[PDB]
Design an enzyme around this catalytic site. Structure first.
Site, PDB file in Angstrom:
ATOM      1  N   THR A  83       1.089   1.919  -8.279  1.00 24.94           N
ATOM      2  CA  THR A  83       0.579   3.170  -8.816  1.00 24.94           C
ATOM      3  C   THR A  83       1.700   3.889  -9.566  1.00 24.94           C
ATOM      4  OG1 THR A  83      -1.051   3.295  -7.016  1.00 24.94           O
ATOM      5  CG2 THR A  83      -0.684   5.277  -8.291  1.00 24.94           C
ATOM      6  N   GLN A  86       5.146 -10.895  -4.596  1.00 17.99           N
ATOM      7  CA  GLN A  86       5.728 -12.189  -4.263  1.00 17.99           C
ATOM      8  C   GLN A  86       5.565 -12.478  -2.767  1.00 17.99           C
ATOM      9  OE1 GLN A  86       8.858 -12.532  -7.954  1.00 17.99           O
ATOM     10  NE2 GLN A  86       9.769 -12.004  -5.995  1.00 17.99           N
ATOM     11  N   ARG A 102      -6.527  -2.368  -7.501  1.00 13.46           N
ATOM     12  CA  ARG A 102      -5.559  -3.411  -7.194  1.00 13.46           C
ATOM     13  C   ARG A 102      -5.523  -4.431  -8.335  1.00 13.46           C
ATOM     14  NH1 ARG A 102      -1.121  -3.429  -5.047  1.00 13.46           N
ATOM     15  NH2 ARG A 102      -1.934  -2.720  -3.004  1.00 13.46           N
ATOM     16  N   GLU A 147       0.806  -1.217   0.000  1.00 13.81           N
ATOM     17  CA  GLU A 147       0.000   0.000   0.000  1.00 13.81           C
ATOM     18  C   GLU A 147       0.846   1.277   0.000  1.00 13.81           C
ATOM     19  OE1 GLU A 147      -3.364  -0.502  -0.431  1.00 13.81           O
ATOM     20  OE2 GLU A 147      -2.967  -2.666  -0.255  1.00 13.81           O
ATOM     21  N   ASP A 190       8.944  -4.504  -9.593  1.00 14.11           N
ATOM     22  CA  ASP A 190       8.226  -4.526  -8.320  1.00 14.11           C
ATOM     23  C   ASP A 190       8.057  -5.988  -7.933  1.00 14.11           C
ATOM     24  OD1 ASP A 190       6.129  -4.427  -6.344  1.00 14.11           O
ATOM     25  OD2 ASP A 190       4.816  -3.166  -7.543  1.00 14.11           O
TER      26      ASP A 190
HETATM   27  N1  GDP Z   1      -4.620   9.473  -2.255  1.00 15.75           N
HETATM   28  C1  GDP Z   1      -3.563   8.728  -2.632  1.00 15.75           C
HETATM   29  N2  GDP Z   1      -3.725   7.432  -2.955  1.00 15.75           N
HETATM   30  C2  GDP Z   1      -2.552   6.846  -3.302  1.00 15.75           C
HETATM   31  C3  GDP Z   1      -1.290   7.402  -3.381  1.00 15.75           C
HETATM   32  N3  GDP Z   1      -0.347   6.454  -3.770  1.00 15.75           N
HETATM   33  C4  GDP Z   1      -1.062   5.364  -3.928  1.00 15.75           C
HETATM   34  N4  GDP Z   1      -2.399   5.526  -3.665  1.00 15.75           N
HETATM   35  C5  GDP Z   1      -3.459   4.528  -3.712  1.00 15.75           C
HETATM   36  O1  GDP Z   1      -3.358   3.705  -2.556  1.00 15.75           O
HETATM   37  C6  GDP Z   1      -3.602   2.321  -2.915  1.00 15.75           C
HETATM   38  C7  GDP Z   1      -2.363   1.501  -2.636  1.00 15.75           C
HETATM   39  O2  GDP Z   1      -1.251   1.930  -3.452  1.00 15.75           O
HETATM   40  P1  GDP Z   1      -0.436   0.898  -4.373  1.00 15.75           P
HETATM   41  O3  GDP Z   1       0.254   1.735  -5.411  1.00 15.75           O
HETATM   42  O4  GDP Z   1      -1.321  -0.236  -4.805  1.00 15.75           O
HETATM   43  O5  GDP Z   1       0.654   0.369  -3.333  1.00 15.75           O
HETATM   44  P2  GDP Z   1       1.536  -1.011  -3.481  1.00 15.75           P
HETATM   45  O6  GDP Z   1       0.806  -2.056  -2.610  1.00 15.75           O
HETATM   46  O7  GDP Z   1       2.887  -0.610  -2.976  1.00 15.75           O
HETATM   47  O8  GDP Z   1       1.554  -1.390  -4.946  1.00 15.75           O
HETATM   48  C8  GDP Z   1      -4.080   2.350  -4.374  1.00 15.75           C
HETATM   49  O9  GDP Z   1      -5.487   2.462  -4.475  1.00 15.75           O
HETATM   50  C9  GDP Z   1      -3.342   3.586  -4.897  1.00 15.75           C
HETATM   51  O10 GDP Z   1      -3.888   4.134  -6.069  1.00 15.75           O
HETATM   52  C10 GDP Z   1      -1.122   8.772  -3.012  1.00 15.75           C
HETATM   53  O11 GDP Z   1      -0.070   9.420  -2.971  1.00 15.75           O
HETATM   54  N5  GDP Z   1      -2.334   9.347  -2.640  1.00 15.75           N
END
Ligand code: GDP
Ligand code: CL
Ligand code: ZN
Lengths: 335, 337, 60
Positions: free
Chosen positions: B43, B198, B172, B38, B194
């Protein structure tokens, strides 16, 4: 408690297995082999250096002709070599460079590979095109071996092994029971059984057609990275993180022998027997292959020809040669 | 032998192809994204496709539809569970049955968003008890995009629904294998990797990443007020920092440039108005209700450990922000290499 | 949930318990006999003439 009584019964059964194994342990392999002559010093030469990969090699597999072999590298290539001439026969560009295993089908018609993509990709050498992407594992592909042109066995970081029908792309059979990432597998000579080694520090013997685990062997709380059958199919050897190789006997249902020196503490990546079973060859993170006397446990020789980890090895079906592959980007052929 | 001569020429043609491929590989730079779940990794990858790749066509957007539905079910299942765990009451008696219906959905098998489920979701979301539970989300695990999708449920449930670019950026995409997204920029190939999907033993594959060009470590600024109940009340941001320290001290990443992205800066701006940093980090000496003080503190804390750490604040869902930040980061990475 | 996993473990352990085992002395004698019977066929143990070694032939 129902769960407490089942936990208690499992403890009773583990003791029954322990006691039955002790009852069979009437003498050791070392006692039985005490009077056989040492093999004496094994001193192989590098006969070929296979040059062409541009990054670490992770896996290799000989063809059944004892001449062609396939190698896989993080350079995103599978190369098929003619070991006799050193000619490259094919170079296959992989979609995923994150490769951990490769295999040569016994027919010579196909090769396979995969890794962190969680897919076993099959390549048709008589067409080179990807002929199948076998999807279903939920963790990395660590090892794969063909039974024939339409069936392949895989091991995975998802803690399962599987038997696949290549035409349909489906898992025919899923071999469940390991509790940690499975790193390695070896098919019995008669293809009835296979053994797997895993990060639960256990090796499992599986019935290919019945789908069950028949026997489990513990490897002393060290990850098993490599596994190989003894040539008569009645024993197998493992190589582990703790710098130790181990021989296990199926019919006596226990460990018979360990192979180690206290001044070698690095991981083992790879194991193979010689054609007669008398030598056990192992590849090490310290850049060497050590050759052990499988019957007497003494080290018989070394292969020192690499400048980085020995990641993989293989002995030809005709017994004529050993290949080593390395993180230094080279393979060497020895005898 | 004619045949022997042909085999040698085949080998030489292969060597030509391997040399060409090797030349290209030397133009490749591997950017390894790391960070807890998260944090923003997937993203960031999607933004690279928008900014420097093929973007998202109508057809691409259509492909993400079922995953948007699945994000909705996953979010509402999390809140239904939290109602039980935190012992919060529904205002509406009908939501007992609605909660059971949604609870029993097999999310993996969702391909449609039928009227029965849309009604249940809407009625649950509108319950003041569920709103109270949403306000307590720092105490459990809920997507930071849950409110976004649930607010827009009517749009998403309409026949003919086509996901927007924001819907895609937030969704997701489930995978338990490696994610690699390569893109071209200025005659360099950036391979963004990324591994966070995993679930296997990292010790068995971490050496696949020796001497990567650059590590991009993402941290959610908004996790400052979350604690790990299992790890002796370890702050989530302390866990992220511990992971970061393991990364920067790892012997085969000593040549890698390290870029720290303090992401979710937009969520920090909202949370800091009601959740006080000093309650979680009593060393903090800045004003309350002050996002700039908070993010400066978090930065200085994260790198309070020879090696240079570069850092930027980000909002990964804001394409313009990522365009701006990555333009700068690309300059640094190329200069160092 | 856990009762099902636990029953599976018990059933597996019964299967592993109820096998025929031989003496280690026999198992060892059989491995030793195999090695002895196949030693002449093993080029890494028992050097073959240069002319029979494909990796020494000036042919290639
Ligand atoms: N508001 C907001 N949402 C974000 C931001 N970065 C990521 N998200 C959202 O938070 C959720 C988790 O981010 P994600 O990119 O899936 O994190 P990962 O698990 O590291 O791949 C997704 O719905 C993203 O679009 C940010 O800076 N602001
Ligand atoms: Cl930077
Ligand atoms: Zn910068």
């Amino acid at each position: 408690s129902e769960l407490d009584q089942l936990r208690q019964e499992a403890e009773q059964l583990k003791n029954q297995i322990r006691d039955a194994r002790k009852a069979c342990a009437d003498a050791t392999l070392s006692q039985i082999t005490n009077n056989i002559d040492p093999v004496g010093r094994i001193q192989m030469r590098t006969r070929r250096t296979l040059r062409g990969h541009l990054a670490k090699i992770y896996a290799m597999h000989w063809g059944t002709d004892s001449r062609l072999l396939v190698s896989a590298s993080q350079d995103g290539k599978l190369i098929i070599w003619d070991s006799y001439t050193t000619n490259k026969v094919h170079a296959i560009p992989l979609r995923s460079s994150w490769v951990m295993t490769c295999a040569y089908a016994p027919s010579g018609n196909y090769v396979a590979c995969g890794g962190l993509d969680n897919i076993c990709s099959i390549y048709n050498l008589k067409t080179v095109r990807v002929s199948r992407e076998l999807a279903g594992h939920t963790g990395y592909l660590s090892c794969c071996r063909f039974l024939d042109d339409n069936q392949i066995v895989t091991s995975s970081g998802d803690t399962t092994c599987a038997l696949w029908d290549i035409e349909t792309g489906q898992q025919t059979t899923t071999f469940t029971g390991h509790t940690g990432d499975v790193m390695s597998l070896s098919l019995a000579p008669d293809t009835r059984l296979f053994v797997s080694g895993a990060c639960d520090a256990s090796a499992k013997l599986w019935d290919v057609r019945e789908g069950m685990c028949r026997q489990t062997f513990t490897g002393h709380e060290s990850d098993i990275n490599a596994i190989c059958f003894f040539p008569n199919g009645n024993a197998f050897a493992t190589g582990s993180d703790d710098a130790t190789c181990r021989l296990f006997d199926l019919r006596a249902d226990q460990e018979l022998m360990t192979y180690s020196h206290d001044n070698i503490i690095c991981g083992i990546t790879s194991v193979s027997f010689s054609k007669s079973g008398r030598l056990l060859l192992a590849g090490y993170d310290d850049f060497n292959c050590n050759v052990w006397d499988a019957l007497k446990a003494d080290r018989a020789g070394v292969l020192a020809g690499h400048d980085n980890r020995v990641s993989c090895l293989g002995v030809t079906d005709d017994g004529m040669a050993v290949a080593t592959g390395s993180w230094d980007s080279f393979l060497k052929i020895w005898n | 032998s004619a045949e022997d001569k042909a085999a040698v020429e085949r080998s030489k043609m292969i060597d030509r192809n391997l040399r060409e491929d090797g030349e290209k590989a030397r133009r490749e730079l591997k950017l390894l994204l790391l960070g807890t779940g998260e944090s923003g990794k997937s993203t960031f990858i999607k933004q690279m496709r928008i900014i420097h790749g093929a973007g998202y066509s109508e057809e691409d957007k259509r492909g993400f539809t079922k995953l948007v539905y699945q994000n909705i079910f996953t979010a509402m299942q999390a809140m239904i569970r939290a109602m039980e765990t935190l012992k919060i009451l529904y205002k509406y008696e009908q939501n007992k049955a609605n909660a059971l219906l949604i609870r029993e959905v097999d999310v993996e098998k969702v391909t449609t968003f039928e009227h029965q489920y849309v009604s249940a979701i809407k009625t649950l979301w509108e319950d003041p008890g569920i709103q109270e539970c949403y306000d307590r989300r720092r105490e459990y695990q809920l997507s930071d995009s849950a409110k976004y999708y649930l607010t827009d449920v009517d749009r998403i449930a309409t026949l003919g629904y086509l996901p927007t670019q924001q819907d895609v950026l937030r969704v997701r995409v489930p995978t338990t294998g490696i994610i690699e997204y390569p893109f071209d920029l200025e005659n360099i190939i950036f391979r963004m990797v990324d591994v966070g999907g995993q679930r296997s033993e990292r010790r068995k594959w971490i050496h696949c990443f020796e001497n990567v060009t650059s590590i991009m470590f993402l941290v959610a600024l908004s996790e400052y007020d979350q604690v790990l109940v299992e790890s002796d009340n370890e702050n989530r941001m302390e866990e992220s920092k511990a992971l970061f320290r393991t990364i920067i001290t790892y012997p085969w990443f000593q040549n890698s440039s390290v870029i720290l992205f303090l992401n979710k800066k937009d969520l920090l701006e909202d949370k800091i108005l009601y959740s006080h940093l000093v309650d979680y980090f009593p060393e903090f000496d800045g004003p309350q209700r002050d996002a700039q003080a908070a993010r400066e503190f978090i930065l200085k804390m994260f790198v309070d450990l020879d090696k240079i750490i570069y850092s930027h604040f980000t909002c990964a869902t804001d394409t313009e922000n990522i365009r701006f930040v990555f333009a700068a980061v690309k300059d640094t990475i190329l200069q160092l290499n | 949930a856990s009762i099902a996993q636990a029953r599976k473990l018990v059933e597996q352990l019964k299967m592993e318990a109820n096998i025929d085992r031989i003496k280690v002395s026999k198992a060892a004698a059989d491995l030793m006999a195999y090695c002895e019977a196949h030693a002449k066929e093993d080029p890494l143990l028992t050097p073959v003439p240069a002319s029979e070694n494909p990796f020494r032939e000036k042919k290639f």
